[PDB]
Every structure is written in structure tokens, then in C-alpha cells.
């Protein structure tokens, strides 16, 4: 990377210490920029969903795959659940989104609960595979709490055949009272729904698909036990990417796991981490890892850097890891704390081929967590609220109560960080649009048509802390 | 510019990182300093009003031109409105200010609304061109809400002929109960008003006038469409300065626009921006721009630097751009975030020939926005409250709803930043006095009689962030 | 110590300026790390309790000695009290903890007061040396305020013989309603109690014992009067470590005191302080001090650095003192402000053989201060609440009221800093577990099996203050 | 209050408050399986299918028993509900000490 003249600090840099200097640009608009990655993950956008239990959901996987990203499944899930998730994801359409389907004679409370599980805002009533109506907001107000769904149905939905160009579907929704377009198969069976914003995103974004034309998905494996057996089982399940993660990637056990998994020669790209050093990245790549995960305690006040003195600023670590990996032909992923598009833009400029988003996507409808309201009816979802129970479901490992208590004595309990739902960006697609707009604006300011060009021509500067007063 | 010995930081500097070291001075008082610019804009003060819809008003243009500045009109205004504004501004007197005129039989609510549109605090009643009285504050209290103006009039206004030396006009207002001096033409028709503070400012300040002895004004053009036609239309309308602005000035489209406008050879000075690099300034000047606009995402926590990593500290960017432009014979304008006279003083010391003020002037009476009160009756004006509607009035460009939605998907909505009215500095003239006093004190401390001398003898130092604790 | 390339700041570093870079590690888990010190203090953990009146209690001494640390007694205590404390501490068991014993016919209010003096949560009723029952929480609710203890007793306590392996004691408490295991001597007399967490800590931690197999303890002496007589009296009392402390250790009087104490040749290790300079450490070691105490006004906003400009950042001072002392064969102790395990980890990485904890341990049950509740019933203990009275008990020194007032005129009154009790970490053993977990995680991240190896292979980096925004 | 298996747990919570017994019986093929009581829905998944938090610890007595002995049978019971079934084992009703 290139810095300004004389900008050679005696310290590691964070995302608050750097800025991008505008250069000569010929890019007309944001749409003239290609965001496709070259790391082999197959994503058309540099957004990757972290493998956390409170974020890596099935609906999230479907949505992110359709919008061009990829989601890594948690490593504690059973093989049957992973196989079911992969089969459901790879059976989805590349344009339409799977709507919330309600059978007749169901409870109205169940319908209200299912309404908020997706950003469409309308749940279709289906009988014999045929749509009957859409249940929308305020339909349950004043109605008997024991209503049987087929009492407040609104059979006023716009219908179009599957395969219609979304350009005309957008026009058909110009004067519709509900921004939902239920499209049915030629035999009349339900296939999916569309919306004006969904049609625009379908025309803007490019879905990330495998060689079979199906949505891509990823899965993770732990560092304990027979790693080869789990890797083989996940590869047979249809996973397109394997991620071997841990708190400290630069250890002998992770090297042994990488050697064991790479010996099988499954052909899938391999992701390992996390390291924040050039030596660690080189050691991980030499062991057989194609993608190196970067970022260990990036924050200066995070729990890791308060328990221990171990850590490193994200920007310098990513720069060093990318510089070490590119000469070996590998790629790096930014696995820090991302809460603004500036972080993603700076990570891409540093040389990272992909940026993974963690807890930020937990505050969306598509996240597996259940929606609950605060005292002021603030929509929010409890991060790590039920992940601890799922974590200890596999942590027990059949050990006795004495061993479990001995392990848990030193273990520090992660608190449940409340994350308020953004009313203007409730769906994860809005956050994806925000991040992609930020990255495209960065590319236009720099004057690059694609991410490698952005990394090539980026010019950075250093600023002091006095500007934050 | 000259810095202290050993003050060579490894980072770019903001306005919080620098300070002015006092030197040997022989300037007796603040009044012994000339603030006239040499950039060719014709302003007697380095204050320029930004071309924003919520600030660039007609009354603001008149007031700033009379006080020695200049105002750039928004580029989205129609040619007829711009022509009307120019004709009204160039038909104003160089000393007296245009008062609020109320015709008889009007609504008292309309009179109360018109009272707050200017800082005079008294609205004159005019019939057959002759003043009848002045409606002042608290005149509408307790009176019927449907009063017809000519029921609470106060015919106790001091009258003086037009052309009287303001020195005696100040004495005539020594014991007057209302600090308004209505002056009428020799035929008895109304021409304008004056006040003690207005007389003092008329004796202190020098109006910025063109070759015809009329108040100066500027207009802006967009970067889309036939730039030459708009430039020709504005030049024919009587504009004295053209400003071609955009988010990123260092692009090929802006270079083409500069080449197209300069090919017409209208003779007017040309302003282009924005760039924060020496290469960008050189490219803009070579294309045919006489004045370069500086500043792109100056704040470390601004919306631009949170969406993207693109930006630069204002001080270093202004210094570099001025150093690059002066050797080419051009001039630079500071277009950062100005909220204190320190910012203007440091920008002038850096080498900028003019400093443009944006949202700061929106919280004044003369701003085009309407005055409204908070729950605690706090006077304030909604910045960008109606500018969005005016922005989309020209952004539609006859495109279809599909294209408009596709454009607006990536667009980020600018929030309406409330700006409270300063009770002691409600009028923009008070802010102008504050800024000019700050600049004059800076000049006296440095020991310079004019802005080029201030830039010549200025000595700067660097301070750490520990002083802000 | 080793820093990253180019990380050579022009200033002294605190604990907020440094971070630990992960290296190649082969440590399987936290339990594969040995925390034993090599400074000669005999502690199995680097935790040392400060010699403050509000912290250095008898129960605290017993608990810290059993958990592997050491406690220094205040220097103002009389020789009889110190002898009694040493005799009580050295008469304790290496596994079981001394419970709260209640005799029959006592006041129930006294029982309630004694309940909160230890973290067991159950006070045993003893008659003729035989346990009768355990008084637990909520037993005093609704009961007459003048109850005689033997009216709400619960004779449902699990009993095991002394010497039983805690592995089976843990199993015996699996279904017990009270997590207290009262163990009695073979003659049936009470000897102590145990708990599940206590059994785990007994199996994890190693008690710090002297050559006689008894818990270790330390005492302090003032710098005034005949230091040799006090040192001889404390050595005869059974103290295992002597600490000569003062505000400014690098003074002639402290050198004379060190020479006087070392002339006696008591054979005990000697601790002196405090100094923050290499010259001071060398002077103290040459005078006859085996351990040098480091840290004088470490905070940038502490009372010492606000009264005077005297001070130094803790990290740089500790590094310099350790570097100076190791070549002379001595050792250094970190005596700064410790509130997080990160501070202890960084102090150990800097080269310190032990880290002393001051006011942090005051907010525990085992501290000598009495427990009192806030308006919201917040458990807290008044730091320095009664230490001032004990300080002036020896400060009077038989001087007249005139001399006392003359001394106290310049003296600044230390305020009583309220320290809230942590509900999840009420006992000091929980804080010890937290700190040891932090240190073990640091060691695993670095890749060291013991503290000297941690100091050998540690690699540090420097970060700017912009990361704290 | 009778709850069939595979029903929504929210419906069970709603049905719990419809009577003063405080316990809703789970019935399958006319046979009681358990009683859903208060705080059973706390922390449990909002989409629970009833037959996941059932408590099969209900006291059973034949219909026609003198309530004097039914009161004694409920002296130490943790739930003050006495589910009584018909001689063929089918559910007929419930009783309590106060009842």
C-alpha cells in the first residue's frame, strides 16, 4: 500500500488513524464499479456473514446468498441440521424470495409471530398450494386473540407468472396498496414473492451461485476431535467453503488440523484463523490453508484486550497479513469489529479480499434470534441470548460435572449485548445496500472499477487524535 | 508557510493541531487592518456564503453584499428566478437596508410573520409609497387575531432625507424609543431604513460593488447537461462570478465542464472544486479554472468520512492546495466546516484568499428558511428541511419512477440538523462582526495590515492532543 | 523486552499504550501454565496483597496464603497483634477454610453480622466442639430480633472426615441444598468446611507454604525510629518477608534503614520502595535490598500527580527498573494501580516478578472493613473509612497538640472512596480466579509455560490514542 | 383446561389464565399426560409444541371419591390440582383443596 510523504508513524494504525486521499477518477457513477471478489469464494460482494449462532441463520443464509454474499454455518450444529439447511438453501429461486406461508385454521398469534420473521411485511395464506390472501400489519388489532387466520384474510394480492422480467413487476406494483407481488407457478402453485425494492435489488445485485446454479453456502468445523471426519461430512453435505476457526490460529493444533483437512483433497477453498502476524499467515498458508483469517482482539477496550494484553490494531494487522499472503498467492479476510461502511472500505483498501460482519447483522429480521420489544416497544434481539445454551450443548462432550465445573471456573461469561433494531434498516438487505453504497462511493472517489484496482491505486494518509475533540 | 523549529509531524494537521505564535507588531488597533481580498472576487471581507438552498437567500445575498461579502446562488434555481434575484439585488442602496413593508388592510398574522424576516425589528406601513408607521414587537398581543394592520400602528418614527451622513443619523437615534430611522426620498417616497448599529457598520464596512456601482452576486451551475448554455444564461443574467461545484472535483467530467465553460470566454472569474490534493488543484487550474475550491470530508466523524474512508484534514489540504495554486497564479477557497472565527483565521493564514461559510449562516433571520419555535419557544430554523424537495425538483430530470428509485436506493438521506437561533446574534451581521473581529485580532497579534502580509509573516506551531483533556 | 520494528516512541508508555502481539504457541490449555514466581517470595501466583489497613486483614491473609499468594501486614500494628495474626494464620489447614462459628444462646443479629464476614454463606453452630447446624440467608427474616441462635438452626449439613480427597467431596455436594461441606476431626471436633468451588480451587491452586508446611505471611515496617528493633521483633514473630515502604524510596533515610536492617542478617528477603528510576533501583539493591518496589504516582490524574508534578507512567518505569535490577540479580514488584487483569499481564510481561494489588481487594468479604449497604442496598465497604484513625494512632508519636497541628496543616486529607461489592465476585477468590485466568490466557497467547518464558518471548507493540475515540 | 399435543405454547399460555385452577391438563386419546403450569413458558422457545415442557407428576384419584380423602391426598402435593379420571381411564375433571 502507498502512504503520503512523511507519514511514517511509530505505532500501529486503527481505522480511526487513516483516511483515503481522493485521486483522479473517470468512473461516471457508483453503478460502473464491479464488486466481485477474486479470492475464490464466489461472492459478488465483499460481505461475508460470521459463523455465530445468533447471526448465521437459514433465512439469513438464503438472503445473503441471493444478494451476492455467503454465510458460514456454526460448527456446533449437527450434521443432519446442516444437511437440511443446505438442501433448503440450494432449493431456492435466484430472483424471488421465499415468503411466510400460513395454513388455514392456524392461530392468529402464530400468524402475528410469523409476520415479523421477514422484511416483506405480508404473510401469504396458502391452501392446496394456492395463495388465498396476505395477512399484513394491524390485522390482529381488536380481532379475537383466538382467530383462525381465515377470518381477516385480504384476497387483494397482485399476481404475475414466475419468470416475468422484474422491470414490469415494478410497474405492476406502482399503485398497489401492498408492496408484495405474489408470483405463482404455471400450474398455479406458489413459488415466491417480489417487491419494488426486491426487483431493484434483483436488477442491481448478482446472486452468488455454484456450478449447479444454486445459492452458495459455507460451514465451519471446530479444532477438537477428528477434523477430517467433520470436513468430509460437510463436503458430502454440499458445503462450498470450509472455515476452521479458533481464538488463536497460530498454534500447533490448528496447523495439525489444517494438515489433516488438506490431506483429504476435497477441492474446496479452506479458511483458517485467526492471526495478526505475517509469520502466522505464512505458517497457516504453508500448512495448506488457501484463505487466512485476520483479527485477534482488534478493539482497544474489548473484552479480549481487557482480560489480557493480547491484541493488535485491525488496520496494520490486515495490511501486514495481506502483504505476507499475496506473495504466497493466498488471500486474507478481515474479521474485526465492523459497524460502519468505512471499516469495510478501509479493509478492502488494505488488501483484504473479503470483510466478514459479525454482531452487526444480528439486529435484523433474518437473524435466527426471536424478535422481542423493550419497555418503550423498541424492536431488538438478544445477542448471545440463546447461543450460550447451544455452546454448552456441544461443550459438555460427555465430561463429568467435575470436569465441566473445572473448565467453567476459568471461563468468563459473555454478556448478552442488546442490539436495537433499526426502523429504517430492519432488513439485512438495507444494511447490505448501505455497505455497498459506501464501498461504491469509496471506489468512485479513488477512481477504480474493481476491488483489485482499488487496492492498487489507493493512497492513504495518517491523522492525529486531536481531530476527535 | 513557516513552522517552528522541530515541528515536523508525521501526520496531516487539522485546526485543533495548530496555533499562531505572536510576533512583533506595530498595528495600533483592529481598525488599522485592511481585509480586502486579491483573488478577483471583489469582496472586501474574506467571508463567502455557500451555495446551499437553506442559506443562499435573496435577503442574505443583499445583506452580505452590502457588508462586503458575496453569495453564490444554488444551481437548481430556474433562470427566471435567478434573473429576478439579480435584478432585485442590483437595485438596492449601498447604505440603507430594505425594510419590511406592510400595506394597509393586511392580516395582522401576516404582519407578525413578516416582522421576524429581518433583524430591524420594525416593519414599516406604506401607503401610496409614504411611510405611515412601524409595527413592532408585542403589538399583536391581546389584539384581535383578525386585525387589519392599520389599527395598532405607531406613527412615531424618526425621518431623515436619503443621503444624510450616518454620523448625524446616529445622533438622531440617541433618544428615540425605536432604533429604526426611516429615510424617505426627496419626493417623500420610501427608500430604506437605518439604525445605530447599521450606521456604524456602514461607516466601518465597505460594500462590494461591481463596475456599475451595484451590489455583487454569484451563481452556481451543475456538472450535468450543457454547462456552456447555463453559464451563458447566468452571465447574461448579470452574475459576477460562476462556481462549478461537485462532491469530487478531481474527475474527468469536471475537467470537461471547465474546458467547455472557459471556451466561451465570458471574462468572469471561475471557481471549481472540490479537491484536497496539489495534483487536483493543478489539473483544475490547467483546465481553465481561476479559483480552486478546497475541502472534501474535512471532519473526522462527518457523514462522508463515516460512509467512506475518503477525506483529508482541512488545514494540510488547504496549505498544499494554496502552495500548488500560487505558483500557477491561482487562488484557493476554504470550503470546510466553519463554526468559529479561529477556523477562518487559520484558513487565511494557511494561504486561502477566501473562506466560505455553510450551515453556520443558516441560523439567521436573513436565511431563506422560515422561523419556527421549539417546545421551549427556542428560535430555530430547520436546515435541509425543504432543500430536499427542491433538490429532487431538478433531480427527477424527467426520468421514470424505476430510474428514480434505482438512483435513490444507493442515495443516503441527509438528516434535518436543527440549528438554534442565537438570541444575541440573531442577524447575520452580528456573525459577520464576530468573524471580522476575530480576523482583525489575529492580524493585530501577527502584526500585519492586510491578508497577504498576514500569510507572509504568519508563524505556526504544533500542539498535541493531551491539551484537550 | 522486544518491541515491533519502528515502534520507538518519544515518550513514556502506560498500560493503554501497549499491546501483546500473538506468537507461535504450543500450549494446549490454560492449565498447562505454571505461575510460580522465582523472586524468593514463595508465592505460586504473582498476586500480592498491599499493606493497607483496609485490605490487609487476617481472613484475607489466610485466604490469599491458601490460594498461593501473600499478604503484607500494616506497619502501624502493634507487635502483639502481629504475633497473634501470625499464630492464627500458621495454625490453619492447607485445604479446608475456617468457617464462621456461632455459639448457642448468642444474639441473632450477631449471627446475621457474622454471616457476611466470609463467602461461604453459611455459619456453623458449634457446641462442645461439635457442629450442630448451619445458619444461612433469610433465616433471620420474620424471626424475632432477639432470637438466641438455637431457634432457627438447620441440622441438615453434609459431613465428611478430614483428609478426604476433594474429588469425592465434590460428588457428595452434587445434590446438597447447601453448598457447604462441614468436615470434622476423627474425634468429632470441628476442623473446617469445604465447597464445590473450594474443592476445585484446592485441586487447581497450590498453597504457598514455608519450610514448616504452614501458610506464609509478610509484615511491613516504617522508616521512622529504630528500624532494626522492629525488624528483629517481626522476624522473631514468624514473619516470612519484610517490606520497608515509603512515599519516596530514593532517599538517604531509606538507604540508612536498608543498611540497618540488612546488618542484622535475618536471612529473610527484603523489599524496599518505591522508585521509578534505574538509579534508584541500583541504589536500593546496593544498600542491601533484594526486592525493589516500583511505582510512584502512576496515574496521570491521581492525587499525587495533581498535588505535584512528580510521577511516571507505570509501564516504562517497571521496564527500566526490571532491566536495571536483573543485571544486579534483584527483582522488582509492580506497585501501581491495578484494576484489570490486563495490568497484571503487562506488568509480568515487562519483567516484574510480582504484582501487588491495593484498593481493588478492599471490595471483598475477606477485607477487614465492615460491610454496609447503600440507599439501594448496594453492598459496599468504605475504603480508608477507619484507616485514618489507625494512621493517627501511631502518627501522634507522643508529640504535643501544637506539633500535631503543625504537621497536619500541610497534610492533605485522603477521601473515603466508596467501592461497591461485585455481586458475582463478592469473594476475593473470584477476583483471584479472574486474574489468574487472564494471566493464563496471556501466557497461552504468547506461548509460554512459565513467567520467565513469558518475559523471554513476549513481543510488544505501540498504539496511538486515536483508538480510544 | 385441556391441551392437545402439538399445539402452540402461546395458545397454552393463553388458555392457562382462562380458569382459576392454574394448571392445564394435557390430554391424548382421552388420557391425561401432564399439567402445564405457570413459568413453564419462560425462556422456552416461543414456538414450542406443548409436549416439550409437560410435567407428568399429577395426583390421580377415581371419580366419585369422597373429597375428604382427596383433600388429604393433596396435603403434600406440589401442585394443588387433583386430576380424576373415569373408571375406563378417560378424563372427567379436576379437584383442589379449596374446591
UniProtKB/Swiss-Prot annotation, chains A, B, C:
It is an enzyme of class 1 (oxidoreductase). It catalyses: IMP + NH4(+) + NADP(+) = GMP + NADPH + 2 H(+). Activity is allosterically regulated by the ATP/GTP ratio in a pH-dependent manner. At pH 7.8, GTP has only a minor positive effect and ATP only a minor negative effect on the activity, however, at lower pH values, the effects of ATP and GTP increase. ATP-dependent inhibition can be restored by increasing GTP concentration. IMP and XMP are competitive inhibitors. Its cofactor is a monovalent cation. NADP(+) binds at residues 245-247, 295-297. InterPro entries: Aldolase_TIM (IPR013785), CBS_dom (IPR000644), CBS_dom_sf (IPR046342), GMP_reductase (IPR050139), GUAB1 (IPR005991), IMP_DH (IPR005990), IMP_DH_GMPRt (IPR001093). Gene3D superfamilies: Aldolase class I. Homooctamer composed of two tetramers. The oligomerization state is regulated by ligands and pH. Belongs to the IMPDH/GMPR family. GuaB1 subfamily. This is GMP reductase. It comes from Mycolicibacterium smegmatis (strain ATCC 700084 / mc(2)155) (Mycobacterium smegmatis).
Amino acid at each position: 500500500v502507498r502512504f503520503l510523504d512523511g507519514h511514517t508513524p511509530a505505532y500501529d494504525l486503527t481505522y480511526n488513524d487513516v483516511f483515503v486521499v481522493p485521486g483522479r477518477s473517470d468512473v461516471a457513477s457508483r453503478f460502473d464499479v464491479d464488486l466481485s471478489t477474486v479470492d475464490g469464494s464466489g461472492t459478488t460482494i465483499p460481505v461475508v456473514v460470521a459463523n455465530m449462532t445468533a447471526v448465521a441463520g437459514r433465512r439469513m443464509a438464503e438472503t445473503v446468498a441471493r444478494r451476492g454474499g455467503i454465510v458460514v454455518l456454526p460448527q456446533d450444529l449437527p450434521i443432519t441440521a446442516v444437511s437440511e439447511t443446505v438442501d433448503f438453501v440450494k432449493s431456492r429461486d435466484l430472483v424471488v424470495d421465499t415468503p411466510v406461508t400460513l395454513s388455514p385454521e392456524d392461530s392468529v398469534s402464530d400468524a402475528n409471530a410469523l409476520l415479523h420473521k421477514r422484511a416483506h411485511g405480508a404473510a401469504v395464506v396458502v391452501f392446496e398450494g394456492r395463495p388465498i390472501g396476505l395477512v399484513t400489519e394491524a390485522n390482529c388489532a381488536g380481532v379475537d386473540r383466538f382467530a383462525r387466520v381465515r377470518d381477516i384474510a385480504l384476497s387483494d394480492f397482485v399476481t404475475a407468472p414466475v419468470g416475468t422480467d422484474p422491470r414490469e413487476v415494478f410497474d405492476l406494483l406502482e399503485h398497489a396498496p401492498i408492496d408484495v407481488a405474489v408470483m405463482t407457478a404455471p400450474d398455479g402453485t406458489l413459488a415466491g414473492v417480489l417487491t419494488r425494492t426486491g426487483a431493484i435489488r434483483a436488477g442491481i445485485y448478482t446472486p452468488a451461485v455454484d456450478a449447479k446454479g444454486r445459492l452458495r453456502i459455507a460451514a465451519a468445523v471446530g479444532i477438537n476431535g477428528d477434523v477430517g471426519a467433520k470436513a468430509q461430512a460437510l463436503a458430502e453435505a454440499g458445503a462450498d467453503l470450509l472455515v476452521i476457526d479458533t481464538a488463536h490460529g497460530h498454534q500447533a493444533k490448528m496447523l495439525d488440523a489444517i494438515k489433516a483437512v488438506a490431506s483429504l483433497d476435497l477441492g474446496l477453498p479452506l479458511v483458517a484463523g485467526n492471526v495478526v502476524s505475517a509469520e502466522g499467515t505464512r505458517d497457516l498458508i504453508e500448512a495448506g490453508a488457501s484463505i487466512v483469517k485476520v483479527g485477534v482482539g482488534p478493539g482497544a477496550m474489548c473484552t479480549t484486550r481487557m482480560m489480557t494484553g493480547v491484541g493488535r490494531p485491525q488496520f496494520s494487522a490486515v495490511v501486514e497479513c495481506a502483504a505476507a499472503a499475496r506473495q504466497l498467492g493466498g488471500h486474507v479476510w478481515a474479521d474485526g469489529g465492523v459497524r460502519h461502511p468505512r471499516d469495510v472500505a478501509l479493509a478492502l483498501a488494505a488488501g483484504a479480499s473479503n470483510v466478514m460482519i459479525g454482531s452487526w447483522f444480528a439486529g435484523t429480521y433474518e437473524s435466527p434470534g426471536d424478535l422481542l420489544f423493550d419497555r418503550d416497544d423498541r424492536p431488538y434481539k438478544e445477542s448471545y441470548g440463546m447461543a450460550s445454551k447451544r455452546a454448552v450443548a456441544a461443550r459438555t462432550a460427555g465430561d463429568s460435572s467435575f470436569d465441566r465445573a473445572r473448565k467453567g471456573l476459568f471461563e468468563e461469561g459473555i454478556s448478552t449485548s442488546r442490539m436495537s433494531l433499526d426502523p429504517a434498516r430492519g432488513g439485512v438487505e438495507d444494511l447490505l445496500d448501505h455497505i455497498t453504497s459506501g464501498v461504491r462511493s469509496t471506489c468512485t472517489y479513488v477512481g477504480a472499477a474493481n476491488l483489485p484496482e482499488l487496492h492498487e491505486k489507493v493512497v492513504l494518509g495518517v491523522q492525529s487524535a486531536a481531530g476527535f475533540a
